[PDB]
Design an enzyme around this catalytic site. Structure first.
Site, PDB file in Angstrom:
ATOM      1  N   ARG B 195     -83.886  50.589  -3.561  1.00 28.47           N
ATOM      2  CA  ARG B 195     -83.416  51.124  -4.818  1.00 28.47           C
ATOM      3  C   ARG B 195     -83.177  49.940  -5.747  1.00 28.47           C
ATOM      4  NH1 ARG B 195     -82.451  56.553  -4.656  1.00 28.47           N
ATOM      5  NH2 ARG B 195     -81.984  57.477  -2.631  1.00 28.47           N
ATOM      6  N   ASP B 256     -80.420  38.808  -6.340  1.00 28.11           N
ATOM      7  CA  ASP B 256     -81.402  38.942  -5.288  1.00 28.11           C
ATOM      8  C   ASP B 256     -81.693  37.539  -4.809  1.00 28.11           C
ATOM      9  OD1 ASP B 256     -83.167  40.279  -3.604  1.00 28.11           O
ATOM     10  OD2 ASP B 256     -84.325  41.157  -5.216  1.00 28.11           O
TER      11      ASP B 256
HETATM   12  N1  LIG Z   1     -84.723  41.764  -1.528  1.00 25.90           N
HETATM   13  C1  LIG Z   1     -85.421  42.903  -1.674  1.00 25.90           C
HETATM   14  N2  LIG Z   1     -85.451  43.817  -0.694  1.00 25.90           N
HETATM   15  C2  LIG Z   1     -86.135  44.958  -0.816  1.00 25.90           C
HETATM   16  N3  LIG Z   1     -86.842  45.286  -1.902  1.00 25.90           N
HETATM   17  C3  LIG Z   1     -86.900  44.468  -2.976  1.00 25.90           C
HETATM   18  C4  LIG Z   1     -86.180  43.195  -2.911  1.00 25.90           C
HETATM   19  N4  LIG Z   1     -86.399  42.575  -4.067  1.00 25.90           N
HETATM   20  C5  LIG Z   1     -87.187  43.373  -4.802  1.00 25.90           C
HETATM   21  N5  LIG Z   1     -87.496  44.504  -4.164  1.00 25.90           N
HETATM   22  C6  LIG Z   1     -88.341  45.586  -4.727  1.00 25.90           C
HETATM   23  O1  LIG Z   1     -88.179  45.553  -6.144  1.00 25.90           O
HETATM   24  C7  LIG Z   1     -87.348  46.619  -6.587  1.00 25.90           C
HETATM   25  C8  LIG Z   1     -85.873  46.216  -6.594  1.00 25.90           C
HETATM   26  O2  LIG Z   1     -85.667  44.972  -7.247  1.00 25.90           O
HETATM   27  P1  LIG Z   1     -85.175  44.931  -8.756  1.00 25.90           P
HETATM   28  O3  LIG Z   1     -86.423  45.026  -9.542  1.00 25.90           O
HETATM   29  O4  LIG Z   1     -84.542  43.599  -8.840  1.00 25.90           O
HETATM   30  O5  LIG Z   1     -84.299  46.120  -8.838  1.00 25.90           O
HETATM   31  C9  LIG Z   1     -87.533  47.726  -5.583  1.00 25.90           C
HETATM   32  O6  LIG Z   1     -88.564  48.591  -6.041  1.00 25.90           O
HETATM   33  C10 LIG Z   1     -87.823  46.954  -4.297  1.00 25.90           C
HETATM   34  O7  LIG Z   1     -88.698  47.629  -3.396  1.00 25.90           O
END
Ligand SMILES: Nc1ncnc2c1ncn2[C@@H]1O[C@H](COP(=O)(O)O)[C@@H](O)[C@H]1O
Ligand SMILES: Nc1ncnc2c1ncn2[C@@H]1O[C@H](COP(=O)(O)O)[C@@H](O)[C@H]1O
Lengths: 493, 493
Positions: B195, B256
């Protein structure tokens, strides 16, 4: 979501709001969601919990909410989801290594008091402070904001003297002696102490053995006005409330970041109205400050910070290389502190430190001429004057003034280590000693701890007892013993 | 302390154990204390809350505990206070900027999955990682441990293809297109998504608009085997379970950390059984990777990490300078992704990126000759083959296969910002755009978000619509307008 308040009997240590599962589903409320509960002016922030414990149209607030607020049973309230605080942004700035503006710091603290910021955010801020630090401007701003967010004690006596230790050194029950001695001389010394953070027993933990330590600020004023002193827990009251919340994160992580520590002690002093403050810095291997240069530097911070708060601050850099006295853990330390006061006799390490600290205060207070304070402190202790004063503090605080120190209970389970070889003690490891005492169950179990029979430079013969571990429970004792074997806290050459 | 289980209909988002107040006093138990509940093999770590809800000799556990632990009503259990976890020391070592040994890392992960480490410790670990980072040895150690901590999906197909984006760029609904396209080509692509972390919407949030995203591993296997693909939430299943717990802190703090990110994505790929992995790295202003050289470095990390897991990893460094497509936030993004699949027509930025990524996978898959993959992907999209596959995934996931994208509800509270002056758009601030969308209520309010009418290099006339804000709630809309006004996301020159 509009609902009627039901008061639920549970203390989770957080503000808990019980939401009806059907109501929660309807309102799109998820567990641990941050919500605001408001009626009129009154507002509170709580963490969502879903349960059938609460009927429809019913919102449950934990007993925690009650202390700083006024919500009646059945009173209608509005429950609205609350967004991430703007202050998280400031926490993120500190994380990046940026200096915080005063207004930013003010925002974080109010958010902490408000409960808008919770364990994840608070822990993040504390971790950031630990890794990235604070400058003097940030600390002064943090201290004032922490103090301003709470009530301030008003004492008709002046000047107001205070003593505080940064701790770290094991078995530092020293200030328990110091306060009665200073008060005995007629000075006003209203002392507040935290519970253990990096140690087996905080001073409040020790005092709690023989007296209540949780009081309202009003109760504190009455005690201090009548007795001239107090030994109370800083946490129990709305003095620097931000500090109480922040300490919990520190306690969990076993850290005490220096900028936060400076803000935490000093903010309580400012809130109490303290004008003359004595800071003790245990210095040496195994403690928060390894070196004198480090201690001197820390001392300057305390002094500069006090000057900014309008406080007169004096610092004693004391030896923290080994445990003070012969005891670690709340009951054992209490027994040692009480007997030393009552008989006027006890371990040299404790008595010398306590008399020296009290002596500085006596001179600061103007009751002792220059250079005679330590001697005056000894006379007060030896004459039983400090003991008479202590009896009063204890009675005022709900304790028994006729308490017999040797009769205070200590951990039932015991194991004693003996010297493997003949020799002289070359070192005692403070960190190892604290860890063992904690393994034994300190401070949650007051009886738990270590009794130490040896100190550095002292000759020993094989089979001489080095220390005894005390624990309430056999499992805890075994863990402490296991830890003791690996650590080898006492080193004999 | 020995007690008997009472299962309570309470869900706090944490393992909460209710302890009787009289019992708590006897056991020296206080609120928020960590306790270990033991039967035989059965073990759980819970957070104490004192309550008069349960009788003497009774511990109240949330029904939540039952999911991974087989407790039964009235079962005799042992309730013991848990000491501070050993791994906290390692977390502390990380704070001090030390490199973590494999055992230290493994211990931290065991502790997270065990729920031994709670929000404070986890937040502290994530924050410490964010400030101090991880080297390749640590990350590799972290990834394997997280994967090993959970179950492994067994799919009777090979090779297994996967795609993942590091995100950051707003409106990245792109992989929503990519999966149905690759699957349409007969390739096996079982996608998992988180999410929102730093964004307005995680892919999981977007997919949830039109289909269920939470499934058991058994369900995933059934869908992927029948359909050949899935678009699901990674959090809901026991693959790299540690990752799901850490992300909560990450979401709350809007960070992140890079080493954590690599370990998180790759551990899930490994748990899923993916052999061929395509990683998308949006590169540009306002995103996690500012420059191409930085993207190449991160790309090298993903590839080396994959090599350690025996996976073939290919990385696409895409343009992240501006939002992909015209939408930000879950419902709006869903409408854009579904519409692009259904009509084969959509924003150039989305279609071009999606076909390009799908094309790399098609070539990697062997379904496309070198250099023809992007063309093949476009043919699959235009012919409606991708759409037919998407309809399958949606039906299998409990969604309506016949939904009309145009008909998906979006927030009915709107405000449109228009051009103050004539000129060309020279920049769009991704950071501002995500913040405004979040202020609007995304992703919690699926309807909330931004519809973007303009892109960089586009000529505009004074009064041309720039973007529209959508909100489900008036207050949320108003806060968004305020941010947008202060922010001024679109730069015209
Ligand atoms: N550390 C992480 N773990 C899992 N998914 C991530 C991660 N970083 C980015 N994503 C992917 O990117 C989106 C979430 O990152 P954000 O764009 O920073 O909200 C989701 O669609 C995730 O599948
Ligand atoms: N940051 C702080 N805030 C309040 N009291 C402290 C602090 N650091 C040390 N102390 C004192 O030292 C003891 C706790 O520190 P420790 O010895 O590390 O557990 C208590 O008796 C406190 O009064």
């Amino acid at each position: 979501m509009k609902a009627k308040i039901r008061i639920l009997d549970m203390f989770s240590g957080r503000y808990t709001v019980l939401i009806n599962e059907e109501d929660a589903k309807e309102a799109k409320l998820h567990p641990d969601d941050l919500v605001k509960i408001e009626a009129g002016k009154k507002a509170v922030y709580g963490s969502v919990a879903l349960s059938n414990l609460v009927g429809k149209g019913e919102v449950g607030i934990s007993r925690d909410v009650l202390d700083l607020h006024n919500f009646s049973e059945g009173e209608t309230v509005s429950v609205i989801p609350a967004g991430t605080p703007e202050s998280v942004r400031y926490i993120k700035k500190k994380m990046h290594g940026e200096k915080l503006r005063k207004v930013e710091i003010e925002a974080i603290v109010r958010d902490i008091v408000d409960r808008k910021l919770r364990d994840i955010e608070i822990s993040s801020f504390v971790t950031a402070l630990e890794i990235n630090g604070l400058d003097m401007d940030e600390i002064a701003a943090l201290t004032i904001a922490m103090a301003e967010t709470g009530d301030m004690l008003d004492i008709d006596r002046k000047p107001i003297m205070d003593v505080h230790s940064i701790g770290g050194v094991p078995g530092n029950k020293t200030n328990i002696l110091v306060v009665p001695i200073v008060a005995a001389a007629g000075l006003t010394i209203p002392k507040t102490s935290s519970r253990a953070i990096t140690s087996a027993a905080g001073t409040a933990d020790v005092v709690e053995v023989f007296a209540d330590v949780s009081f309202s600020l009003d109760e504190i004023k009455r005690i201090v006005e009548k007795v001239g002193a107090c030994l109370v827990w800083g946490g129990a009251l709305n003095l620097a409330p931000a500090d109480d919340i922040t300490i919990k994160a520190e306690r969990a992580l076993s850290i005490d970041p220096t900028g936060l520590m400076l803000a935490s002690i000093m903010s309580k002093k400012y809130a109490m109205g303290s004008q003359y403050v004595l800071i003790d810095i245990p210095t040496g291997k195994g403690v928060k400050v390894e070196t004198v240069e480090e201690a001197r530097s820390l001392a300057r911070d305390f002094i500069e910070l006090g000057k900014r708060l309008g406080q007169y601050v004096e610092v004693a850099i004391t030896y923290g290389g080994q445990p003070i006295g012969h005891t670690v853990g709340p009951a054992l330390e209490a027994r040692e502190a009480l007997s030393a006061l009552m008989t006027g006799k006890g371990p040299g390490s404790l008595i010398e430190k306590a008399t020296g600290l009290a002596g500085i205060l006596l001179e600061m207070g103007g009751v002792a001429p220059a250079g005679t304070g330590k001697k005056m402190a000894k006379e007060i202790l030896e004459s039983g004057k400090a003991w008479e004063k202590m009896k009063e503090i204890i009675e005022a605080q709900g304790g028994d003034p006729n308490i017999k120190p040797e009769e205070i209970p200590i951990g039932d389970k015991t194991y004693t280590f003996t010297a493997a070889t003949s020799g002289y003690v070359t070192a005692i490891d403070n960190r190892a000693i604290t860890a063992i005492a904690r393994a034994a169950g300190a401070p949650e179990d007051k009886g738990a701890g270590i009794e130490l029979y040896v100190k550095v430079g002292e000759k020993v013969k094989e089979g001489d007892p080095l220390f005894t571990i005390h624990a309430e429970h056999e499992a805890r004792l075994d863990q402490a013993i296991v830890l003791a074997r690996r650590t080898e806290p006492i080193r004999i050459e």
